[PDB]
Design a protein around this ligand. Sequence first.
Ligand SMILES: C[C@H](CCC(=O)NCCS(=O)(=O)O)[C@H]1CC[C@H]2[C@@H]3[C@H](O)C[C@@H]4C[C@H](O)CC[C@]4(C)[C@H]3C[C@H](O)[C@]12C
Length: 127
Amino acid sequence: AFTGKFEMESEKNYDEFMKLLGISSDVIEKARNFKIVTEVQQDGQDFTWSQHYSGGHTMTNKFTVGKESNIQTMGGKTFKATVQMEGGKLVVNFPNYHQTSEIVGDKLVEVSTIGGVTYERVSKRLA
Ligand SMILES: C[C@H](CCC(=O)NCCS(=O)(=O)O)[C@H]1CC[C@H]2[C@@H]3[C@H](O)C[C@@H]4C[C@H](O)CC[C@]4(C)[C@H]3C[C@H](O)[C@]12C
């Protein structure tokens, strides 16, 4: 399940991926500098996913898998999208953009992708 604290820390194609997502360089750079922290409370199909970034600014997110849900995209951008569950993976899709998240070896890891580049993430599990 996706539950407990997590420590986002090693990433790939981060700057290109965020630039394609459409993000300002100052926050791309400072976000990388700030090791991101994350926490999740899976709840029988419902979820309350949370983030802490660019100076640990907290943000809350939430959805039910299979259903469309509103997904804020930082204080500024926003979109609606469907979060999904293909067994262990927490699959998800967006207009012209896709990702899948997954727990492996009791670690939160993900395989995000956009435009024409991957974006693996790694986030150790902790409490
Ligand atoms: C890519 C987004 C921002 C990550 C971040 O913190 N970046 C640093 C700031 S910026 O980029 O540099 O501006 C994050 C913020 C909230 C995220 C969403 C929410 O956490 C809710 C779910 C969580 C699921 O595990 C994956 C799908 C998802 C629907 C997430 C997709 C994506 O990872 C989002 C939209």
